[PDB]
Design a protein around this ligand. Structure first.
Ligand SMILES: NC(=O)c1ccc[n+]([C@@H]2O[C@H](COP(=O)([O-])OP(=O)(O)OC[C@H]3O[C@@H](n4cnc5c(N)ncnc54)[C@H](OP(=O)(O)O)[C@@H]3O)[C@@H](O)[C@H]2O)c1
Ligand SMILES: O=C(O)COc1cc(F)ccc1C(=O)NCc1nc2c(F)c(F)cc(F)c2s1
Length: 316
């Protein structure tokens, strides 16, 4: 199948990317260098991951070594919640460009629909543990993001963790200039997202699946939470194809026409994760994998459930 998907801005986005959340600063530079050597051309980053400078070192080294040209790379970053205010959006984007050492981003996403009080703290909490919200609304933040496209700082803009009603709010924004090109959401066999994906694709918005392997290294992961990598049913499907369960879990979203960004700092896994273009899951395999859905969401935070723009109270 095609290695890249067409965005509404006319650009092509590689369907397979390397995730960087939780990749240690002292290991992420080597991880990205190896990824590029192996063929990855799409890297997913975020200022909140606190490792963008190190990711940038890897990109610059490979550009300098002439292993790849800038136009061949698709770099993605995200605007954190404490910079939703109209006047802080550009500076937040410039800081990321500075750390990544690039003069433009291929895609810039609003990380979460929730705006937090501005400050040095990523999660400002009040005396009772509730996140302190800012009185900014998604529409004004979108307007500020559109300005980055007109100024040449980013080629395309998108959203992440937005439910269908929040996507609709943007699509119905008065004066809408640029439609969101991508909605990056959690997606794996235990959280299939059929409704939201169908909705987004029907609107011409590309969906990127994050935490495709269940994010086993998430910090809040608890000793006996479900494990996709060890699900016997998924292991059986992998065995039948002579592939690993990770390769099956990565191939799964690809056949649903989604972009997938698995994370790894391990050279062997980085290479194994890229060898998913040589096999195909049957329609039967796909429908079976979809039947494992349990609406089990791993990426959410209790401290944000009171925010007016919390995205997961809606069914989708
Ligand atoms: N927009 C958002 O709100 C948002 C939220 C969550 C995630 N994301 C993005 O999505 C990316 C991926 O999601 P994620 O980091 O949550 O988790 P993930 O990719 O589902 O899982 C990462 C874990 O799987 C392991 N792994 C990788 N390949 C493996 C393989 N072939 N075999 C066995 N284990 C393997 C990794 O180990 P090693 O690293 O030790 O190899 C790591 O512990 C992120 O890094 C980030 O870029 C975005
Ligand atoms: O965010 C990432 O890329 C990966 O995750 C994280 C990555 C980091 F570098 C720091 C924290 C998280 C985290 O705690 N993640 C869970 C969230 N859930 C919510 C939530 F439900 C909201 F309504 C608003 C919000 F902002 C968050 S953050």
């Amino acid at each position: 199948m095609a290695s890249r998907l067409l965005l509404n801005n006319g650009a092509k986005m590689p369907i397979l990317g390397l995730g960087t959340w939780k990749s240690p600063p002292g290991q992420v530079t080597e991880a990205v260098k190896v990824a590029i050597d192996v063929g990855y051309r799409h890297i997913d980053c975020a200022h909140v991951y606190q490792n963008e400078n190190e990711v940038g070192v890897a990109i610059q080294e490979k550009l300098r070594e002439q292993v790849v040209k800038r136009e061949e790379l698709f770099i993605v970053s995200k605007l954190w919640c404490t910079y939703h205010e109209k006047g802080l959006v550009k500076g937040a984007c410039q800081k990321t460009l500075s750390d990544l050492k690039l003069d433009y981003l291929d895609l810039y996403l609003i990380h979460w629909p929730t705006g937090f009080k501005p400050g040095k703290e990523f999660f400002p909490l009040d005396e009772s543990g509730n996140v302190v919200p800012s009185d900014t609304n998604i529409l004004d933040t979108w307007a500020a993001m559109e300005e980055l496209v007109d100024e040449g700082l980013v080629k395309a803009i998108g959203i992440s963790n937005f439910n269908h009603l929040q996507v609709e709010m943007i699509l119905n924004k008065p004066g809408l200039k640029y439609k969101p090109a991508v909605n990056q959401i959690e997606c794996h066999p235990y959280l299939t997202q059929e409704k939201l994906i169908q909705y987004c694709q029907s609107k011409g918005i590309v969906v990127t699946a994050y935490s495709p392997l269940g994010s086993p290294d998430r910090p809040w992961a608890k000793p006996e939470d479900p494990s996709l990598l060890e699900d016997p049913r998924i292991k059986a499907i992998a065995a039948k194809h002579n592939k690993t369960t990770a390769q099956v879990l990565i191939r799964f979203p690809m056949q649903r026409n989604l972009v997938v960004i698995p994370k790894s700092v391990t050279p062997e896994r980085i290479a194994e994760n890229f060898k998913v273009f040589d096999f195909e899951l049957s329609s039967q395999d796909m429908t079976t994998l979809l039947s494992y859905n349990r609406n089990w969401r791993v990426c959410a935070l209790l401290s944000c459930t009171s925010h007016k723009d919390y995205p997961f109270h809606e069914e989708f």
